[PDB]
Amino acid sequence: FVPFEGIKNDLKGRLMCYKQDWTGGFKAGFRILAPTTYIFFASAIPVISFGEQLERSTDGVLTAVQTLASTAICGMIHSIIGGQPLLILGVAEPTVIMYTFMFNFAKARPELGRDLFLAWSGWVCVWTALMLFVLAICGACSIINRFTRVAGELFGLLIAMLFMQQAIKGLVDEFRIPERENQKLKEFLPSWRFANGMFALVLSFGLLLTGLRSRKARSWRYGTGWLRSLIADYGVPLMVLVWTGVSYIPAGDVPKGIPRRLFSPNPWSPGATVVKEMLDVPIVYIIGAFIPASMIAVLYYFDHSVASQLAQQKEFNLRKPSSYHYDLLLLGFLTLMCGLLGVPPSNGVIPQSPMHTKSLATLKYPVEVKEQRVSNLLQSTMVGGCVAAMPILKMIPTSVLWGYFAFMAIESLPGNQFWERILLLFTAPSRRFKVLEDYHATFVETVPFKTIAMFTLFQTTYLLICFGLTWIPIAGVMFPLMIMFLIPVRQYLLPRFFKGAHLQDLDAAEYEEAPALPFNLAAETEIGSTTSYPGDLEILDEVMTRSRGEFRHT
Template sequence: MEESFVPFGGIKNDIKGRLKCYKQDWTSGLSAGFRILAPTTYIFFASAIPVISFGEQLERDTDGVLTAVQTLASTALCGIIHSIIGGQPLLILGVAEPTVIMYRFMFDFAKNRPDLGSQLFLAWTGWVCVWTAILLFLLAILGACSIINRFTRLAGELFGLLIAMLFMQQAIKGLVDEFHIPERENPKSVDFQLSWRFANGMFAMVLSFGLLFTALRSRKARSWRYACGSLRGFVADYGVPLMVLVWTAVSYIPAGTIPKGIPRRLFSPNPWSPGAYENWTVVKDMLKVPVLYIIGAFVPATMIAVLYYFDHSVASQLAQQKEFNLRKPPSFHYDLLLLGFLTILCGLIGIPPANGVIPQSPMHTKSLATLKHQLLRNGLVTTARQFIHKNASLGQVYERMQEAYQQMQTPLVYQEPSARGLKELKESTIEMASNMENINAPVDESVFDIEKEINDLLPIEVKEQRLSNLLQATMVGGCVAAMPLIKKIPTSVLWGYFAFMAIESLPGNQFWERMLLLFTALSRRYKGVPCHFCRNRTIQNNCHVHDIPNHILVCLFRDYLGSGRRGSFPIDDHAFGSCETICFAQVFQRGTPSRFGCRRVRRIPGCTIQPYNRRRAG
């Protein structure tokens, strides 16, 4: 993204770039056929379940003024609009926990004001949304999103790691609460007796850990040695949603022998219940809010605008990481402008606004990367086998595969063509054939293992389209009408899914993967940082990652001692200087060769190079 602080300059560039590929966004999704349902259902559950949980939390915090019906409606409405006219279709919108927290603070403020109260709470939040939208308009028009380029990958990954920790914290907190009496419940009820509370908590742990374990295992079903390939693929694509249904069914096994409230299930009013639709006409009450509170709404609006600016932009940035090899331009400025309009819309109809969410957005991109890999793999395997059966030579097979590969690519290429995988495939296969002295002979699968080679070397690409986002948002909207069925899901299944989302968002986070090296045995560090969505073998084999733990510890140690806290340690200045010098020398001596190369390092006086130890375990 080019930096553009000219008013309307960034928005103009975003609209121009996305209009060029708007038609292809739809045709690409339709061309995937029924396969698009796999990432759609995967991201639908990842989007709907947290929103339902946040809706329950809002209901407790706002005394029933806002419920899961409103959070689902907001997520569906904003998601549908963004998928149709938004800039970046990979970005998933939803009601996030920071929004829930801000609404709780605003409700606590409003209910204690006699001239505002809970009756005008939604009308006042409407003014908060208006101020928030104005600030978002200014940020988008003035090109504030250009600062996103200054955000390093570390900043985005730290934020993503924080969100993952919050999801895990929510899962643990929810499991602990299963052993306690919920708020606003009758403590004298039979199912809240000590023995039944303990039984409910233990059963909740079984359901939560059962869902977590089976969901994680189902994501790796393609590498199983059991069952046929189509069944393994089905489990990998739809296993997580199926596990939610399976463990919900398991929760009904002891029905009839235990109190009705065990296990605890979701609670939310139906959308057709009396009073459930009063918030939709909140716009008529906005003029009843005193002028002082209309002006004062600017204060929480400022905090929400800053929060949305950072959260929305980072979510979009994480969904467009470099290793995904996206071929279409970003749209940070225009998406922020559209978010302002969506915020006003949500405020006028009395529902909490939605914004770009983490980890759902990068999870969406990863699921589409898996889909694109399957489509390319199946097409190339079919082409290769077709010409191998015609006794074609290796060169002919490669040429046909290259033609098929180019035909499956989008013509809107904004990056270098990602044909590296096929180039490596050609080189490795020709080398193997040369060793067998039959390079011009017809190719058979003893020389050319079609599925293995293509699966390992095919470059990572993403099926960039709008259909999956539109379908998942529509399905979230369908949850509003299906609320009686959703209320049958145990809350413990939600906590297990929260933990699954936290763990599922960690692969690909380079900060997390490098932190794991602190606990990796020295003899195993030659494997380097795992690159789940980057199959560049050269990078994996040549990364000098065995010193990364030392670098992390030295940086943390030096920053801590150098930030004015030396008095906290019984270390004098001479000892501190010696320690710092030794640590820096260790980092420079061992870390510099991998950055600057051996020839340049040899010219530095007093610097020696230690050979890289590639010994294997065992």
């Protein structure tokens, strides 16, 4: 933990591959645009959704303009002078939640109010930048190996819960009058409001289901290869466009605001740095900003490092070194800059970074990744240009964004072992052989079900407590402390209750899977030792057709 050692080593390592980092990007030619566009679409849409969320949560102080600007500027700076260009930066949901807490605190205090919210947030960002500088200089990133699966998966499920909560919140508001809108408009009559709510339900569920189906296009037996890849890569934006077009079908027979569209304003309209108002904040609140700043620094020190680790998985066979410490230092500087500019800070986001690395990967029949600084710079510049295209983006209905929130919530589940363990916990004892008939984790076979159940119950209790804490008006801004407390807990307390190899299998740093087992081998196991025979109607359901009741012959 020698000060400045990690930063110096990272800088020495990354300074030998800068010119190559650029030339290899230019040598790829126009073929570098496909990963660029893919990651640009993967980054922009969630950022716009978070911007709308903030617009609703901050009474219009922060909108999609600010989130897009922060994402673009931070991404460009990271691409040019950052250590690991594979890392993708952007505004994330936890930052939105923290800023919502801060806004709610400031609004109820006359000394700050809505007019000094951004100044107080700038002071918070100054504190966060200092904390991140200290963490990077002291080499705190040398212990990121202790950021085990138990904390990451719990945080992911918490963020998925919050995504779904936001989706439900928005869909319920689609039936209500907005707070800052003229209540006398025809679009806000009870009939038109009910119609708008129903149309929002239709559009949101359509987007969600169609995108979820599109995600598995490359496995279809239909169409061309390029068409299947196009669907699998750009389904989300394609479905957003399709459902916007659908929303425009009744445009001629309904009022202007049916369905409701994005509330974020257009920056080009004449109606439209916070350092000047920063001096006006009372000293007591300048000092008190230390409190949320510590939580934000915790969140960033976790998320940045985890995203970089995921983007630098050893299976990619990357040949260039890592820059964790210098990356955290630059993140502190970027947070200071964003606080001074009046925009929310950005940080490493998941799964955008590993998806970018994958988009830059090819197999030599064996993974080889094309690492360079051009794709990140171009995608960040496109995210920035999206600000100028705000008139076009304002045509998107809000229900589509709520559907996208639900989409992210559901997409956080697939590879999450905590979710699989919850499903197993709620599974019937006589139907676990079914669990054993498909791809499954190894701890299902190597760990007794009682220990899995106890571990999952502890994890679920922790998750529910954190979710409930998020609902407390003021104390809810402490949930990153609860997230970090899982490190010492896993390191010290769990070994007392759990026995070694069981913990290692249940909290493995590597995703270990197992292939499907034959039915005969799925019963000799302890977990599948309570196999019950199928019923008569269960058997007949499979040997007779549903269309005409015809017996199938095999």
